Amino acid sequence: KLPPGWEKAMSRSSGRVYYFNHITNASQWERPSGEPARVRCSHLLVKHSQSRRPSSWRQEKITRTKEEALELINGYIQKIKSGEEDFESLASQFSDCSSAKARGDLGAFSRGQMQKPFEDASFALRTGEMSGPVFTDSGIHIILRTE
Q1: Would you call 115 a catalytic residue per the annotation?
Q2: Has 41 been annotated as catalytic?
Q3: Are residues 18 and 58 in the same domain?
Q4: Residue 28, domain CATH
């Protein structure tokens, strides 16, 4: 039927069909378009109190809850999808990862290098596609596949 991870769903507000990816947590109205040894991605990380290291260049002691971090992630996704903000600009300003200084870019990587939920989402994304919230032990991520 559909590319890997994608399933059809029903909107509760509008009653129209949409599409959801259970590997990337991406969702969209239109039927998705459609594996390499390597992909290239950028990300925006929002850390919280249960993160492996509750610290970042933005905050010596990160105290926000997991629920608060998810709300921030959802808000960044909204601004990116509406075009009020670009992914790289939000990543440079607000990602709790050191890669913020490189507009979130992590470079190219293979399977077996990143944390598993991050890796699975990255390889399920198409070039140019962005994930929904992805949970790892670092925190909550938005991932943009660039190559």
Answers
A1: yes
A2: no
A3: no
A4: 2.20.70.10
**Which residue's structure tokens are 């293979």?**
110
Question: Measured between alpha carbons, how far is 44 from 67 in angstroms, rounded to an integer?
Answer: 17
Domain of residue 113 covers 38-147
The answer to whether residue 131 is catalytic is no
Q: How many helices (H) and strands (E) does the chain have?
A: 3, 7
Q: What is the CATH number of the domain that holds 101?
A: 3.10.50.40
> What is the distance between the alpha carbons of residues 15 and 33, in angstroms, rounded to a whole number?
22
Q: Same domain, yes or no, for 25 and 82?
A: no
Q: How many C-beta atoms surround the C-beta of residue 73 within 10 A?
A: 23
Solving technique: X-ray
d(CA 8, CA 127) in angstroms, rounded, equals 21
**Domains identified in the chain, total number:** 2
Quote the DSSP letter at residue 31: P
Does 141 participate in catalysis according to the annotation? yes
Phi first, then psi: what are they for 115, rounded to 5°? -65, 145
Tokens of residue 92, six digits: 């440079």
